Amino acid sequence: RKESYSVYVYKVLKQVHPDTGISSKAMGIMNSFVNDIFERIAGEASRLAHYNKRSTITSREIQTAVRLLLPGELAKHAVSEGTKAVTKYTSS
Amino acid sequence: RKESYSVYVYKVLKQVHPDTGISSKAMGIMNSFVNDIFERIAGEASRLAHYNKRSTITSREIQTAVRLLLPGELAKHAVSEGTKAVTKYTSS
Amino acid sequence: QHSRRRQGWLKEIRKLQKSTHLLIRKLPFSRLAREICVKFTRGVDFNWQAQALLALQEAAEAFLVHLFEDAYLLTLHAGRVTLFPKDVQLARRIRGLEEGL
Amino acid sequence: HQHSRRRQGWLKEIRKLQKSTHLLIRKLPFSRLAREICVKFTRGVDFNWQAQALLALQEAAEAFLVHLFEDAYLLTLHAGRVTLFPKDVQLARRIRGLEEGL
Amino acid sequence: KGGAKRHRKVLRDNIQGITKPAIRRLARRGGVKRISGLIYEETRGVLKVFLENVIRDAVTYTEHAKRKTVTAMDVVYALKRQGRTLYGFG
Amino acid sequence: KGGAKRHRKVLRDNIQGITKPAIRRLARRGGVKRISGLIYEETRGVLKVFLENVIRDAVTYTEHAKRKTVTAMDVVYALKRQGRTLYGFG
Amino acid sequence: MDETVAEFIKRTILKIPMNELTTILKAWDFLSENQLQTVNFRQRKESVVQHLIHLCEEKRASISDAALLDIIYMQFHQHQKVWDVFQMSKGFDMKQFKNSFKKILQRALKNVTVSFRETEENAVWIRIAWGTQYTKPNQYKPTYVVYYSQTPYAFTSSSMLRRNTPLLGQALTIASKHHQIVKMDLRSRYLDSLKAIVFKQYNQT
Amino acid sequence: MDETVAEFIKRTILKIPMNELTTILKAWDFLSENQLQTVNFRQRKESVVQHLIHLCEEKRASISDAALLDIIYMQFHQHQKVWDVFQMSKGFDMKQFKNSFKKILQRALKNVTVSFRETEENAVWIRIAWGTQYTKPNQYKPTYVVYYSQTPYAFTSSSMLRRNTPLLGQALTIASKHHQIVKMDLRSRYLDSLKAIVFKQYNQT
Amino acid sequence: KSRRISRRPSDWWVVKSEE
Amino acid sequence: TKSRRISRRPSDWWVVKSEE
Amino acid sequence: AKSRSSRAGLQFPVGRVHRLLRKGNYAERVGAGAPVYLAAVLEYLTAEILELAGNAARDNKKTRIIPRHLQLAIRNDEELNKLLGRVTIAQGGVLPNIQSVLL
Amino acid sequence: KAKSRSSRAGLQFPVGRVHRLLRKGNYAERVGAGAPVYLAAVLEYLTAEILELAGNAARDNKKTRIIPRHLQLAIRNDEELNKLLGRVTIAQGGVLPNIQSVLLP
DNA sequence: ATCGAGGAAGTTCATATAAAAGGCAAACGGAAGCATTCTCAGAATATTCTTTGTGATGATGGAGTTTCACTCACAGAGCTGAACATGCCTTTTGATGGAGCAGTTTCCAAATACACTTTTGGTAGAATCTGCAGGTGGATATTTGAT
DNA sequence: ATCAAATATCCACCTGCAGATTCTACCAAAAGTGTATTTGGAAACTGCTCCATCAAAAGGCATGTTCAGCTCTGTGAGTGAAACTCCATCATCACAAAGAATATTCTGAGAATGCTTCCGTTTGCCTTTTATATGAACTTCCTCGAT
Numbered sequence A, B: 001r002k003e004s005y006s007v008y009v010y011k012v013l014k015q016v017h018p019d020t021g022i023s024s025k026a027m028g029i030m031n032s033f034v035n036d037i038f039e040r041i042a043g044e045a046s047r048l049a050h051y052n053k054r055s056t057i058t059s060r061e062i063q064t065a066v067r068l069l070l071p072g073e074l075a076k077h078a079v080s081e082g083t084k085a086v087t088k089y090t091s092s
Numbered sequence C: 001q002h003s004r005r006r007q008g009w010l011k012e013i014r015k016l017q018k019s020t021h022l023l024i025r026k027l028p029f030s031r032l033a034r035e036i037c038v039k040f041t042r043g044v045d046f047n048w049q050a051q052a053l054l055a056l057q058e059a060a061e062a063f064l065v066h067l068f069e070d071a072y073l074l075t076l077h078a079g080r081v082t083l084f085p086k087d088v089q090l091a092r093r094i095r096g097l098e099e100g101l
Numbered sequence D: 001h002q003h004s005r006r007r008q009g010w011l012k013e014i015r016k017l018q019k020s021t022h023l024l025i026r027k028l029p030f031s032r033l034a035r036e037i038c039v040k041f042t043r044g045v046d047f048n049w050q051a052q053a054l055l056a057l058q059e060a061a062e063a064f065l066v067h068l069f070e071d072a073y074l075l076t077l078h079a080g081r082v083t084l085f086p087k088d089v090q091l092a093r094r095i096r097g098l099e100e101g102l
Numbered sequence E, F: 001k002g003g004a005k006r007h008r009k010v011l012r013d014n015i016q017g018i019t020k021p022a023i024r025r026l027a028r029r030g031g032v033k034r035i036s037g038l039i040y041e042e043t044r045g046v047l048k049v050f051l052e053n054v055i056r057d058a059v060t061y062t063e064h065a066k067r068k069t070v071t072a073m074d075v076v077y078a079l080k081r082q083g084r085t086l087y088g089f090g
Numbered sequence G, H: 001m002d003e004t005v006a007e008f009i010k011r012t013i014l015k016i017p018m019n020e021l022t023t024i025l026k027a028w029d030f031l032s033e034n035q036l037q038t039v040n041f042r043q044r045k046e047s048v049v050q051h052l053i054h055l056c057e058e059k060r061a062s063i064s065d066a067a068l069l070d071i072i073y074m075q076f077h078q079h080q081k082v083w084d085v086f087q088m089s090k091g092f093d094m095k096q097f098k099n100s101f102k103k104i105l106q107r108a109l110k111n112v113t114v115s116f117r118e119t120e121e122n123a124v125w126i127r128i129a130w131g132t133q134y135t136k137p138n139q140y141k142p143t144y145v146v147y148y149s150q151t152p153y154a155f156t157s158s159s160m161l162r163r164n165t166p167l168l169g170q171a172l173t174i175a176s177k178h179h180q181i182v183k184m185d186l187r188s189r190y191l192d193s194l195k196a197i198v199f200k201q202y203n204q205t
Numbered sequence I: 001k002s003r004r005i006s007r008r009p010s011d012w013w014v015v016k017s018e019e
Numbered sequence J: 001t002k003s004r005r006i007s008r009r010p011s012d013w014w015v016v017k018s019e020e
Numbered sequence K: 001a002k003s004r005s006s007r008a009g010l011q012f013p014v015g016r017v018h019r020l021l022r023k024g025n026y027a028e029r030v031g032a033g034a035p036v037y038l039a040a041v042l043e044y045l046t047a048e049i050l051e052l053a054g055n056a057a058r059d060n061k062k063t064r065i066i067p068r069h070l071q072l073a074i075r076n077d078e079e080l081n082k083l084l085g086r087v088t089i090a091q092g093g094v095l096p097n098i099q100s101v102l103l
Numbered sequence L: 001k002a003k004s005r006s007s008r009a010g011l012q013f014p015v016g017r018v019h020r021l022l023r024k025g026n027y028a029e030r031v032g033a034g035a036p037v038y039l040a041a042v043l044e045y046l047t048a049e050i051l052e053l054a055g056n057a058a059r060d061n062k063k064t065r066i067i068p069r070h071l072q073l074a075i076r077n078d079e080e081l082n083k084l085l086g087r088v089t090i091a092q093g094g095v096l097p098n099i100q101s102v103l104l105p
Numbered sequence M: 001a002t003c004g005a006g007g008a009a010g011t012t013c014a015t016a017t018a019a020a021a022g023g024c025a026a027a028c029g030g031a032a033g034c035a036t037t038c039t040c041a042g043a044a045t046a047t048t049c050t051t052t053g054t055g056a057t058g059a060t061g062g063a064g065t066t067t068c069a070c071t072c073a074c075a076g077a078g079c080t081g082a083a084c085a086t087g088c089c090t091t092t093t094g095a096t097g098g099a100g101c102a103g104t105t106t107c108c109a110a111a112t113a114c115a116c117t118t119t120t121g122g123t124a125g126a127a128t129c130t131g132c133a134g135g136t137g138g139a140t141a142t143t144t145g146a147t
Numbered sequence N: 001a002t003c004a005a006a007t008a009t010c011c012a013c014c015t016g017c018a019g020a021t022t023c024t025a026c027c028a029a030a031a032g033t034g035t036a037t038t039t040g041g042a043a044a045c046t047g048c049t050c051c052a053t054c055a056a057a058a059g060g061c062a063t064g065t066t067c068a069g070c071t072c073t074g075t076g077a078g079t080g081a082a083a084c085t086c087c088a089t090c091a092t093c094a095c096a097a098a099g100a101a102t103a104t105t106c107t108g109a110g111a112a113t114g115c116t117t118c119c120g121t122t123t124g125c126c127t128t129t130t131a132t133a134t135g136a137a138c139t140t141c142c143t144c145g146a147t
Helices: A006-016 A027-034 A037-042 A045-051 A060-069 A074-083 B006-016 B028-041 B045-051 B060-069 B074-090 C010-016 C026-036 C061-075 C085-094 D011-017 D027-037 D058-076 D086-092 E020-030 E039-051 E055-064 E072-080 F020-030 F039-051 F055-064 F072-080 G006-015 G018-028 G045-059 G063-076 G165-175 G195-199 H006-014 H018-028 H045-059 H063-075 H095-099 H165-175 H195-199 K004-008 K014-023 K034-046 K049-059 K068-075 K078-083 L005-009 L015-024 L036-054 L069-075 L079-084
Strands: G083-089 G144-147 G153-157 G180-183 H083-089 H144-147 H153-157 H180-183
Touching: A006 A027, A006 K034, A006 K049, A027 A037, A027 K034, A037 A045, A037 A060, A037 K014, A037 K034, A045 A060, A060 A074, A060 E055, A060 K034, A074 K034, A074 K078, B006 B028, B006 L036, B028 B060, B028 L036, B045 B060, B045 F055, B060 B074, B060 F055, B060 L036, B074 L005, B074 L036, B074 L079, C010 F020, C026 F039, C061 C085, C061 F020, C061 F039, C085 D058, C085 F039, D011 E020, D027 D058, D027 E039, D058 D086, D058 E020, D058 E039, D086 E039, E020 E039, E055 E072, F020 F039, F055 F072, G006 G045, G006 G063, G018 G063, G083 G165, G144 G165, G165 G180, H006 H045, H006 H063, H018 H063, H083 H165, H144 H165, H165 H180, K004 K014, K004 K034, K014 K034, K034 K049, K049 K068, K068 K078, L005 L015, L005 L036, L015 L036, L036 L069, L036 L079, L069 L079
Parallel strands: none
Antiparallel strands: G083 G153, G083 G180, G144 G153, H083 H153, H083 H180, H144 H153
C-alpha cells in the first residue's frame, strides 16, 4: 500500500510535451527528486519556525525557505509562480 | 535572561586540570560547541525514530546516533562511557 | 606496419562518454564489498539485497570518475599529459576532508 | 653599506603572522564593503548592521581566504614554481567546486 | 551592481580599501612565499563573491522576522546553513 | 583489517579482482589521455577507503533496526547522510 | 515596468495603521476607486498591501509621486518625530518656486529629492532625501520643511543626516527670496506646540 | 583475552525465548549461580544480555567453550531444523575419537569448530562450521551430526553449505571405525518422527 | 510554460569584474 | 579518572599504500 | 465536492503534501496556506527539468526519457547544477567533455 | 535522600536540562527516560576531551588562561577532533604553523 | 682566528583589564509522588528473496615484446616582485548624541485542530493490450587512406 | 593518382521487453460541516544600541626606483605506456530446490505522559576582590658579519 508522486509527474509531462513517454526508471528518479526538494524545503521551514519561536508553518515561511534554497534565477520564479497559486486559492 | 552551559563546562575544567582558568571568550566557544554536538546527535536520533517509524527516542537510538557521527576511535570510547553512565543510572 | 595503430584512445574516450555502463564487473566487486562488511562486528555475514550492490556501484564508480576527471586537471597543470600518483593525491588534499580519506 | 637580502627575508613575516591571531583587514574599509553589498540585496532599504555582525563576517572572510591561499599554494608548488599566479586561485575554486565559492 | 551617477570619474572605487599590503598579509599567513602582481585583482574578485553568498542569506533571515538590524545571530545562521559553522557568537 | 590467515602464499588478494583494464576504462571516461602505471596500485587504495565510509555507515543502520539484510534503502541513507545523495533507489 | 519602487511603497503602507488607511488614499489621489470597490479593507495586512501595489503597478510607477505618500503619513502622525524651527531673513502654489526649488547639486543628479505638497496656509511639505554626487538618494531618512511664503518661519523636520543642515540653510534660502538663516533652540515634538512659541511671537509683535 | 566471540555469544543468547532463558544457562554449566542471583531476569532482554556477557567475558573468554552453548540451543529447538539420517557400514567414551576429531583438511584447520557432548543413548553432539584455507570458519551456519556409537545411523543436520557434503561423511568414516558410508532419503523435520522410520526398522529387524 | 534564460554550465572560476 | 584516546597529530591523510 | 488542487490551478496533490507536512513533525501546527504553496513549487521544478529533458530527448532522436536524458538536462543547465550539486544519478553517465589539449 | 539526576548518574552535565530540550525540540513525540542520561554523558566526555588537550596548549605556551588559540591548537592537532570539526572555523583562531619544505631552506 | 655590532631572550617591572568570589531571590525549573494511558518488546507465523551450485560458453583478462611519444634536468635570456625610503591620507578612538528600532506588554479574532461522515479520485495494483527501441543485417553509401 | 575498405548513416523487418490503457473496488484517503480551542497580529511603550560628527594623532599605505631571484622556452637524453595477438580462466546466465530471514498480525506490562506540591540549583548584579597577562625597560648574553 505504498504511495508515490508518479501519477503526478506523468500528468505534468503530458502538459509540456504531449507525445513523449518516460521510462520506469526515470520515474524512479523523479520520485527521489521530489521526495527530496520537499524534504529540504519543509525541513528548513521547520527551522525558521524555531528561530523566531513561532509554532505554525505558515505560507510565509515556505517563502523564505525557497529564497534560501533555490539559487540563481530559479528562486525568483518559484516565488513568482508560487504566490500566483495562493492568490487563486484564497479568492475562490 | 538566556541560559547556557557555562557553569557545567567549568566544573569539567576543574576536574581534569585543577588549576587552569578559562577566559570569557573561550567559554563562548565551549557553549557553542556543546550546542552543536547536541543538535547534531539529537537532530539525527530524531531520524532513526522516523526511519523505523517508531515514536520514542530511547537510549538505544542515541547509541547509533553516536556511531554515525563521531568518527574514528573517538566513538569507541564515547559509546563505552555513555553505557557506563546508564548502568549506574538504574542500579542506584 | 607498426605505424598505423588506429589511434586507439580517442575513439575510446569518445566511446565511453557516450555510454552509461557499470565499468567494473560484479563478482569481482561484489566479493570486495562482502569482505569489507566482515571487518565490522565480525562473524555475521550480512546478507545483501541484490539491488543494494547496484546501489553501491553506481556510487563508487560515479565518484572515481569524478576523481579522475578532477585529478587530471593537475596533470594538465604541471605541463604533463600523463597522470601520476602525485596528481590524484593532490585532488584529495584540496577537496578538504569530507571527500576522501 | 650593510645591505642584507630581501629584508632578509620574507620568512620573518610568515612566522610572525602564523604566530598571532588578530584581524588583518582594516575594520572601516571592510565595513564600507559589507554595507554596499547589503544595499544591493535589499531593494534600497539600507540596513543597520550590529557592531557584532561586522566582526562575524570578517572572522569568516579572512578564515576562508587564508584557507584558499593555503589550498591554492599546493598547486604552485606542484607546477615546479614558487610564485603564486591567478591560474591557481582559479583552480582551487574548481577542485572543491560549488562549496569553495560558486 | 547598479549605480546611476554620470560623471565618468569616481573614487578608488569602494572595494579598493582592501589594499595592496592587506591582501599580502592574508596570503603570508597562509604560507605563500611570494605573490604575483595579479592576485590583487583576483582576491578582490573572490571577496566580492564570498559576501554575496553570505549577505544574501543574512539579509533574508533578517527580512523574515521583520527587522532592520542584521544581527550576529543571522550571520552565524547564514554561515551554518551555508556549510561553515562559526563558533564565536551563536 | 580483521584476518587471521597465515600461510605466506595465497590467491590474488580479493581486491586484486578489480582488473587493470577496468581502471583504465574508468579513467578513459574521465578524460584521462594517458594513465601512469602506478595508478593501478593507487585506485585500489582510494576505492578501498571509499567503501569503508559507506559500508561502515550502512552496517550501522542495519544493525540498528534489528536485521541481517543490508537493504537498498540503507545504502541510500548511508550516502545521503554522508553527503552524496543518490537518486536511483529511494 | 518598475520593480524597486514597489519596495518603498510596500514598506510605507505597512507603517500606515489599519484605522486610517482610506483616509490617506483619498488624498493620495492615484488609485482608481472603482478598483477600491475590489480592494479589501478587512482581511490580514500582508495580503491587503500586495493588492494595492498590484494597482500601482498597472497605471504609473514614479518614485517622485511615491514620496508624496510618505508626506501625508507624516502630516497626520506629528507626534512621531522631534520637530525643529528655523527662521530666514534678509529678503501661493509656488510655481515660481518650483523653478527655484533648489539651485545646487545638478552635477550630482538632475532632480534628486524633490517632492511638494499643495495646501492652503502656505503649508508646503518639501521633502529632501539627501545624497552625494555618486549615491542614489537616501529615500528612508527624509527632511521635511514646512515654510511659508508670507511669514519667514519654517517647520523643519529632524534628519540625522548632518553635513547638509547648513547646506539646506543656503540652498533653500536662495531658492526663496531671502539671504540669511539663523538656527534657534526651538527643537520641539508637536507642530501646534510650536505654534504658541513661533506664531504667537511673530503674528503679535 | 578474547573479544570477537562476543558477537557470537551475544547474538546466540538473544535467540533464546524468555520462557527458557535461565534453563539453558543452568544447563550450559559454565556459570556459578552465586552470580546468577545478581541478574534481574524480569526487565527488558537487551539490557539483560549485556550483564550476562559482562560476567561471561570476565570469567573466561573461550571460543572452544563458546560453541558448546550453541549445541544446547539446538538441543531445545530440534523441531525447527530439518534432520537428515545417514548410515555407516563395513565396520565407552570414544576417547580416541576425540583426539581423532579431525583426520582431514590439515592446511586450514587443526580442529574445525571442535564440539563434543556426553549425552546418553550413545549420543555425541558434533558442531561443525566450515572454513577454507584463508577463510575462518563461518560461525553462523553450523552442522549438527548426532551419531550413536552402537547403531550405525547418524542424525545429521541439513547444512546449507554445499561442497562439503561427501567431504564430511568419509572423513567421519575414516576417523571412526567404519569403511563404507551410505546416504538415505530419511531427511525429516522431527527426530522422534525419524525414530519410527529408523529405530523401528533397525532394532526390530 | 515560460522560461528563464538557461545558458550553459557557463564558465566561472576565472571570474573578473565587469570592466 | 580521565583516561585518554591516542591523540597523535594531523597524520597527512590523502596517500594510499598497502599496509606492510 | 472539489479537489483543492483544482482550486489552486496546480497538479501536485495539495492534501498529500499537507498530510506529509503534519505527520512529519516539522512543527506542532501547520498553516492552511502552506501546502498549496509547497505543492506549487514542487510542480515548477518537476516541470522544469522535464522541459529540459524534453528537448534533450528529441536531440538524441528518441521519444522516451531514459535516465541519461536527465543527467544531461541538469548538468547542461546552470541553476540546476547548483541545486543538484552533490547528487549522482544512477545510470547517469557523464557529460561529453574532452580536455581540448590532445592534438 | 537519593537526589538529582546528574549526581545519581555520576555525571556533571545537567540531565534534567537535556530532557527538557529533547521535548521542546520536537525531535520525536515521546522521549524515553534513558535517553538524556546517555546524551549528557556523551557531551561531558567530549568536553572533557577538548579541555584535556586544550590544557596543554596553555601549558606548553606557559600560560594559565585558555584563550581561543589554545583550543585551535587542540582541535587541529588531533586526528578525530579534526574530522569531527571538519567545517568549523573558530573566531580568534589563527592557523597552524605550516612550514612548507620548498619555501624553506 | 682576527672583530664590532647588531639582534635576541630574559626578569628587572607594575598597571588595568578581565577575571574568580559571594549571596540572593526569584523567577525558574527540576525532582517527587501518584494515578492513568499506550507504545512496543516477545512470540508465533506466512512466504518473498538471497544464498549456493552446476555448466556452458564465450567474453575478456593476462603475458610478453616493440617502438615511439613523452617526462625530466638543464641552461640562458628577459622580466618582475621585493626592499627601501620618503610623506601624507585615511583608520581609529571617544565622546555626545538623538533616536531609530527592538523587546516587552496587553487583547480578541480570524485561523486553526478535531471529530464524524460522504465519496472520489487517485490510486495503487493486477491483468491485458499495444509500441518503441534494440538489433542484425539487405548491406548501398561512405570518406580516409594506399593503389 | 583509384581501389581498398572498415566507417558512418541509412533503411528495413522483426522479435520482445517494457510502457500504456482498462478497470475494480476498495481501500484509503481527502473534503465538507460544525464547534472550541489558541495563537499571533496589532498597537502601545520604554529602552538599548546604532549611525553620524568633530578631531586629534599617527600609523600605515602609496608612489617611485633599483636589482637578483624567478619563470619560460628549447634540446637532447632516456625511460616507460599504448598496442597487439594469443589463449584460458574467471564472470555471467538460468534454473535450481532450498530456507534463512524479513515481514505482518496479536497481546499486555512495562514504561512514559500529566498533574500537583515541592525544594534547590542556576542566572545576574553588583561588588568586592584577587591575578594573569600586558608594555616598557634592564642587562646579560647569544649570534651574526666584516676580515
